[PDB]
Each structure stands twice: as C-alpha cells, then as structure tokens.
Design an enzyme around this catalytic site. Structure first.
Site, PDB file in Angstrom:
ATOM      1  N   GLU A 357     114.568  46.151  43.386  1.00  0.00           N
ATOM      2  CA  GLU A 357     113.652  47.282  43.491  1.00  0.00           C
ATOM      3  C   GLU A 357     114.257  48.541  42.884  1.00  0.00           C
ATOM      4  O   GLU A 357     113.546  49.338  42.259  1.00  0.00           O
ATOM      5  CB  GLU A 357     113.272  47.516  44.953  1.00  0.00           C
ATOM      6  N   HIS A 487      99.516  38.659  48.232  1.00  0.00           N
ATOM      7  CA  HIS A 487      99.115  38.858  46.843  1.00  0.00           C
ATOM      8  C   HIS A 487      97.674  38.426  46.595  1.00  0.00           C
ATOM      9  O   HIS A 487      96.999  38.998  45.731  1.00  0.00           O
ATOM     10  CB  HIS A 487     100.068  38.107  45.912  1.00  0.00           C
TER      11      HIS A 487
HETATM   12 ZN   LIG Z   1     107.063  40.411  46.491  1.00  0.00          ZN
END
Ligand SMILES: [Zn+2]
Ligand SMILES: *[C@@H]1O[C@H](CO)[C@@H](O)[C@H](O)[C@H]1NC(C)=O
Ligand SMILES: *[C@@H]1O[C@H](CO)[C@@H](O)[C@H](O)[C@H]1NC(C)=O
Ligand SMILES: *[C@@H]1O[C@H](CO)[C@@H](O)[C@H](O)[C@H]1NC(C)=O
Ligand SMILES: *[C@@H]1O[C@H](CO)[C@@H](O)[C@H](O)[C@H]1NC(C)=O
Ligand SMILES: *[C@@H]1O[C@H](CO)[C@@H](O)[C@H](O)[C@H]1NC(C)=O
Ligand SMILES: *[C@@H]1O[C@H](CO)[C@@H](O)[C@H](O)[C@H]1NC(C)=O
Lengths: 597, 187
Positions: A357, A487
């Site tokens: 990240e 998702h």
């Molecule tokens: Zn993810």
C-alpha cells in the site's frame, strides 16, 4: 483560436475546480469510513452528489469539443475521460436506484450478521472473527458453518439485489456505447490512436486465456501437493482425485492459499519464513511495521511519507468507540494529501500488505505533477502491481535478515528457498485461477450467456473445473455465493488483481538486471539499489499520459502481458513439485462431490 | 523612528494575490536584522542587495507588497519564473532590487472545510507587465462566441478561488508573502 487551444483552456479550468471538489468529497469519504455514522454517510452522499453533478456539466461541455483536430496526445486522453457520458444516461431516480442498491451493498456486508445457534446472543459479522475461523480453525464442521451460514443468510439476500445490479447497469449498454458491463471495465486497458500500440478490449480476453494455460502446469501440481497434506490433516473428507473443498482454503472464499502455509509447510524443521511468530517475539506494533516500510522505500530513493500521511492516516484499529472499514486501502485525496487506511495486525500478511500500500502511495506521489485526469496510473493492474513488486522483495529471505525478524544465522539451505517459494506460491499462484474464474463468470453474466435459471449452478461447475474447488453443500439459485466477496458487492474489477500478477514479475526481472543481481529472481532485494529505484520513479511519473503498452516496453522489453517472468521465478519450485507429486494424481475430477455420499 | 514593519508582517489578514496591498514605508529607521534573523521564514531571497549591506544603507522610499499564494507557486514570485501567478497576477521586473519574504500560514489561513476567500487570476488576454495590478473581472473569451458578460461556452470567469484545507500537503498549503522593494530611510 484553434480547437485544441480552446480545449486546453477548458481543461485548465477543470483541473483547478475539480481538484478541490474531489478533495472535499474524498475528505468526507474518509470520515464516513473512520467514524461510521448516519450523519457521516449522508455527508459522503451530499458532497459526493456534488462531485458527480459537477462531472456531468463539464462532461456535456467536453462533448462540444471534438475528439478530432486535437494533436497533443495528453489533450486527447484528457478529453475522452471527461467526454464519457458516465452514469448520467439512466433517467433520474433510475440512477438513484443504482445508488441505493449499491449503497445497500456497502451496508449489507458491514451489517452482515451470522448468529451461533447454540447461543442466540452470539452473532458474528464478517469482522476479523469469521475470517479468523477460516484462517486458524482445523475443524471441518466449524469451517463449514461459517462458509455456509454467511451466504445462506446474507448471500441469498443479495441475490435479487445483484440480479437488478446487472439488469440496471447493463442498461448502460449501447447508452454509454459499450456492449456489456464487462466491456466497460476492460476499457481501462484500451489504448487507441497510437500506431503499433493500439490495444483493443477483445485482446485482453485472448491474452488472459493464453497466459493462464501456461499457468495451469504449476497450479495443478500445487493443487495436488496441497491435497495430500490436507488429506492427512483431514481424513475421509477429502478424496485423492476430487476437487478441494472451499472452506478448508484460507479465506471465507479461498482467494489466498497463504493461510495454509502452516499445514502445507514443505520441511518445517528449518527456521520459519513466516515471521509473525517472530514479530510477536520482536514486539512490532503497527507503527513499527509502517516505519520499517517507510524506511524500505527511502532506501530506494523516494523521500519520506509526507507528515500529512503519518498525522492523518489510520494504521490501527479504532477500538470499540469508533467503527470503521478495516480493509487495506491506499487512499489518495489529491491536493498534496496522501493517507493509508488499514486496520493493521501483528502478522506477516499485514507486514507484507503494508509495504504494497505504501508503494501505491509513492506511486500516487510520483505522478503528482500531471494534469488531473492522467494521475491514475496507465492501467488498473499497474496501480496494484507497483506495491507488490516491492512486496516480493520484502519477503525475500535476504531482506528479512536486515529487518531483524529472521535471526542473524541465515541458513541459505536448498530447503529454505523452497519453503519461501511455496509460501509465495500460495499467495500468488493460487489466487490466479480464482481470479480468472470469478471474472470469467462475471463477464459472461454481463454478456448474458448465463440466464438467472442457470446462474449460481454454473458458477460451481466453473469453480470445479478452473480452480479445482468443490462446494460442501449444493446451492439453489436463491443462493448468491459470488456476491459474498467485497470486490463483487462494491462493483470493483477483479481481473485487475491478475494483470498485476504477471506484471509484478515482469518488472522485477528488469529491476534486478538494473541492480546487476548475480543469480535468480527470488534472491533479489531492490534495497540499496538507487538505479532500480530511479528506473521506477522515471516511469511512475508518466501516469496515464503514455499508453501502458508503451510504458511497459520502456521498463521491460515486452510491450504486452507475458507470463514468462512468473515461470522463471517459480521454476525451482515447479521442478521440485513435479518430483514429489509423481505418485499422487495431478489433476482433479469435475464430477466428484463431498455431498454425493 | 521604528519603521512600521510590525503591522505588515503581523497583520491579522493578508490581501489576495490579484489585489496585492502596498504600504509605503518612508522616513523611518528600519532594523532589517529582525527579518533575516527571525528564523520564522521559509524563503528570504534578496535579489539585488545583500541584507548585511542594506542595514546601514539609506534609501529614498520603501513599499511593502503583501499577498497570500500557494507554496507550489512561491517559486514564481521570482525574476523570470513564468507560471500562472507571475504571468497573470504578480510579476517582478527582472531587474528587481529588493527581497522576497515567505512563511507558512497553514495555522492561520486554513480552516476545517476549507477557506475559499483568497482569489487568483486564472485567465488574462495578455501577460502582466512588472508591478501591474489587474482586477478586471471580465469573462476571458476563449473562443469565437462573445460572452456578453455571462458564464457560458468558452466563457470562463477569469477569477478562481484558492482552497485551503489544513490537511493539505505542503505544496498546497497557504503561504504568506511580503515583497519589499527599494528605489534610487536608513538603519
Ligand atoms: Zn484487496
Ligand atoms: C465521531 O463523529 C462525531 C460526529 O458527530 C464527531 O463529533 C467526533 O469527533 C467523531 N470522532 C472522531 C473524529 O474521532
Ligand atoms: C451522452 O454522450 C453523447 C455523445 O455524443 C453526448 O452528445 C451527450 O451530450 C451525452 N449526454 C449527456 C452529457 O447528458
Ligand atoms: C502539449 O505538450 C504536453 C504533452 O505532454 C502537454 O502536457 C502540454 O499541456 C501541451 N503544451 C502546450 C500548452 O502546447
Ligand atoms: C526521513 O524520515 C525519517 C523517519 O524517521 C527520518 O529519520 C529521516 O531523517 C528523514 N530523511 C530525510 C528528511 O532526508
Ligand atoms: C542496505 O544498506 C543498509 C545500510 O548500508 C544496511 O543496514 C542494510 O542491511 C542494507 N540492506 C540489504 C543489504 O538488504
Ligand atoms: C536438498 O538437497 C538434496 C541434496 O543435494 C537433494 O535431495 C534435494 O535437492 C533437496 N532435498 C529435498 C528438497 O528434500
């Protein structure tokens, strides 16, 4: 006044006014997440309503400027992104329908409650709790209940709501002039108007299909080796030829096999490469984890996370007082503000997730000096690949020595590399079949190849065939297992999670060549290699100004997706896995069933 | 007597960049030492005269131009830097004798939800000449259609406001700028 010069002054007004608007809406979106509250959710909607409403007016004015008779390549791309009709074509409350059903989907997960039958007080959500059952419990009965009750109770509930999701979002078809909702997400990879580099949307299918076939050899043997270890730890339940059950995989869905490293450890007497047992013995809080991550990249060349990152980011769980989304999210707000939201834990997975990240933050930082629209990486897989390119280096056994987690001894045995490679394969190799399967069925739904009377069931035949995973309990179409995953519920692409995977090895090969590494790819730390870091930043800044197929070529020789680097990184593991699985059956039966008994 | 440098720098409010306030400083003794030794200023580029030399250097007249701009744009308050601010708001003579003083105003000129008070000219038909303050709020006609003094196609308001949220990055935070010039007042 030439039409392009009129187009630039229009775009010049856009970049100033939009950046503050995007920042304001994104600021409220952060707050909605940090302090889940009816007032904060509304603030996101009203401010977010303004960002969408602002986009529609500038979009109509952008159509007035023709996409032809403009020559500066950045001007063309900037105009296209604005000129897209968008979600405006649906008439008024019909769009509000799509808002409400999608807004419901963020809430259904956050409010999704499975309740223990033995204690009616004891109800759980998809907090860490349910996921912790799938990650640690070794009871077939315990895992199945969490597997089943979640999509029994909450999946079915979303089935009519995901039914209209396609029906209403495929209304966009031939309104936004794309044929099916699968065509829209594939438009991310589209590059047009560039001779020799024009990549059509249909090429992405054929490319994915071909590279996946070369992936199958390594995956089937991994699938076989995992079955043998599982059959010992789970007698009777698993058949030596049958598809693996979904609940005994690591996650609620089986996205990552990395959880099964403890069960599937090749050797286990050598020092552990999973260092969460060392982190708890090294007393590393979330601040330490990210601070070591910040130190990794500043070694490469990127300076420090802006103080606005450390001051305003949330890298720890709030506690009982504040309810917030805990999913790893490399937020980027514009206007010089860069933050990371990630409930963090004392785990190597969270140690490796943090490094990815932050690499995405530094991606978001490197191309800040670009027009507004071009600051999103050149495709979706790029944004998600840059972080994992570093993450592959972070887990390397040599780099784990410098961090202080693996003891100073560093047994460089022929066994530790295989131990390390198999943990990496579980995280990386296993997710690719699951990715292609999920998105293949997703694309086929938008096209309409699977009617609702064949939905769900087909999903399970495909999951049996492609991924080699079976269902514990038969499911009617009233069940909605696909929309058990974030998702799918939040209408986010998922194939972007696989282009990055072939990408993440494409780049590292060149980065190791830049660092003049003497040996294989799994021995490669980008650390202390200023040259390899300059190579990344030189092409991190390009953003979407240069087509991806062009930016790929400049970094790595290939102009397109190529699986070959991934195979080379895993070639030592692939050869060893073949020798071990000579007696056990490689492959699975599409007809086996754990319920047919 | 003490030059009134205190009220220029410690002002409760600073003017916008498109209407930079000028205060005449004349017939007073000025300690420039407090300025170059304050340690509260990020930028202090004296282009013509060394601050040490001007401490006892008499001068005919002093004026103070004070405005608030973005930190990314502090680069532009400089001889020959181009960019939006110098082009359409405040340009230096390129023979400029004087000094540029800048310090961060995030603590004062940024508020929760953002402050939209400060304005900057975005569009100007012709580049600004040195030391020329333009405050013509007439729609910059970008195409063939005439704007008739209303917003429309290729008809943008030449003025756009700064946004100043405290959580912004350094390159977007508000910086308070004071420009000093000298003509040909001692110390
Ligand atoms: Zn993810
Ligand atoms: C929680 O939300 C309320 C909104 O009414 C606010 O008063 C409080 O500051 C929030 N907590 C934070 C920001 O930690
Ligand atoms: C939809 O797209 C077309 C493209 O030709 C455009 O003319 C139209 O204005 C768009 N609709 C809007 C902006 O509401
Ligand atoms: C054209 O060139 C570059 C292409 O990168 C573009 O960013 C810039 O805005 C354009 N320059 C002008 C104003 O002609
Ligand atoms: C970067 O940040 C680290 C964080 O502690 C600090 O120690 C270091 O001195 C900084 N390096 C710079 C600003 O070059
Ligand atoms: C990078 O260099 C630093 C200081 O020279 C050192 O402490 C660290 O171990 C190095 N990392 C490696 C060799 O992976
Ligand atoms: C480790 O090395 C031995 C001896 O060279 C060889 O059998 C093989 O490569 C490895 N043994 C394993 C993986 O069990």
């Amino acid at each position: 006044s030439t039409i392009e010069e009129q187009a630039k002054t229009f775009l010049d007004k856009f970049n100033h006014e939009a950046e503050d608007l995007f920042y304001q809406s994104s600021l409220a979106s952060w707050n909605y997440n940090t302090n889940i509250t009816e007032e904060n959710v509304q603030n996101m909607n009203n401010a977010g309503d303004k960002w969408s409403a602002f986009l529609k007016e500038q979009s109509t004015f952008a159509q007035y400027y023709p996409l032809q008779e403009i020559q500066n390549l950045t001007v063309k791309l900037q105009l296209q992104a604005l000129q897209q009709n968008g979600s405006s074509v649906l008439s008024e409350d019909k769009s509000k329908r799509l808002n409400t059903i999608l807004n419901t989907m963020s809430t259904i997960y956050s409010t999704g409650k499975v309740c223990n039958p033995d204690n009616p007080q004891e109800c759980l959500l998809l907090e860490p709790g349910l996921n912790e059952i799938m990650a640690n419990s070794l009871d077939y009965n315990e895992r199945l209940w969490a597997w089943e009750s979640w999509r029994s109770e909450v999946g079915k509930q979303l089935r009519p709501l995901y039914e209209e999701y396609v029906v209403l979002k495929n209304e966009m078809a031939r309104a936004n002039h794309y044929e099916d909702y699968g065509d829209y997400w594939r438009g991310d990879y589209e590059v047009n108007g560039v001779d020799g580099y024009d990549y059509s949307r249909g090429q992405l299918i054929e490319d994915v299909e071909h590279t996946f076939e070369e992936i199958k050899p390594l995956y089937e043997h991994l699938h076989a080796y995992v079955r043998a270890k599982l059959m010992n730890a789970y007698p009777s339940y698993i058949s030596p030829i049958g598809c693996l059950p979904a609940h005994l995989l690591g996650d609620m869905w089986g996205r990552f096999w990395t959880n099964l490293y403890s069960l599937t450890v090749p050797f286990g007497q050598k020092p552990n490469i999973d260092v969460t047992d060392a982190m708890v013995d090294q007393a590393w809080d979330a601040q330490r984890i990210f601070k070591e991550a910040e130190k990794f990249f500043v070694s490469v060349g990127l300076p420090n996370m802006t103080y606005g990152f450390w001051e305003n980011s949330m890298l720890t769980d709030p506690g009982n007082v504040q309810k917030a989304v805990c999913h790893p999210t490399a937020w980027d707000l514009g206007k010089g503000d860069f933050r990371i939201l990630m409930c963090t834990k004392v785990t190597m997975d969270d140690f490796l997730t943090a490094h990815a990240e932050m690499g995405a933050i530094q991606y978001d930082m490197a191309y800040a000096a670009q027009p507004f629209l071009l600051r999103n990486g050149a495709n979706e897989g790029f944004h998600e690949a840059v972080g994992e390119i570093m993450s592959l280096s972070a887990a390397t056994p040599k780099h784990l020595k410098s961090i202080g987690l693996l003891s100073p001894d560093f047994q460089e045995d022929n066994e530790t590399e295989i131990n390390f490679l198999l943990k990496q394969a579980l995280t990386i190799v296993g997710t690719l079949p699951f990715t292609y399967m999920l998105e293949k069925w997703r694309w086929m739904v938008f096209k309409g190849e699977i009617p609702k009377d064949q939905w769900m069931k087909k999903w399970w035949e495909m999951k049996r065939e492609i991924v080699g995973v079976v269902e514990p309990v038969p499911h009617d179409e009233t069940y909605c297992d696909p929309a058990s995953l974030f998702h799918v519920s939040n209408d986010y692409s998922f194939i972007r999670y696989y282009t990055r995977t072939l990408y993440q090895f494409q780049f590292q090969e060149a980065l190791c060549q830049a660092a003049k590494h003497e040996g294989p790819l799994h021995k490669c730390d980008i650390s202390n290699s200023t040259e390899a870091g300059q190579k990344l930043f030189n092409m991190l800044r390009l953003g979407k100004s240069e087509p991806w197929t062009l930016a790929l070529e400049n970094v790595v020789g290939a102009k397109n997706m190529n699986v070959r680097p991934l195979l080379n990184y895993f070639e030592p593991l692939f050869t060893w896995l073949k020798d071990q699985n000579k007696n056990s059956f490689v492959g699975w039966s599409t007809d086996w069933s754990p319920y047919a008994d | 007597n003490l030059c009134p440098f205190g009220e220029v720098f410690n002002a409760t409010r600073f003017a916008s960049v498109y209407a930079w306030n000028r205060k005449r400083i004349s017939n007073c003794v000025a300690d420039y030492s407090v300025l170059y030794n304050s340690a509260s200023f990020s930028t202090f580029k004296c282009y013509g005269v060394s601050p040490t030399k001007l401490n006892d250097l008499c001068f005919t007249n002093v004026y103070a131009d004070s405005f608030v701009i973005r930190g990314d744009e502090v680069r532009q308050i400089a001889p020959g830097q181009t960019g939006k601010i110098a082009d359409y708001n405040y340009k230096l003579p390129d023979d400029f004798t004087g000094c540029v003083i800048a310090w961060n105003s995030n603590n004062l000129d940024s508020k929760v939800g953002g402050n939209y008070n400060y304005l900057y000219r975005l569009f100007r038909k012709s580049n600004l000449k040195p030391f020329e303050r333009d405050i013509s709020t007439e729609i910059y006609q970008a195409g063939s259609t005439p704007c008739n003094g209303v917003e429309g196609f290729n008809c943008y308001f030449p003025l756009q406001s700064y946004g100043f949220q405290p959580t912004n990055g350094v390159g977007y935070q508000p910086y308070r700028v004071v420009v000093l010039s000298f003509e040909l007042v001692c110390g």
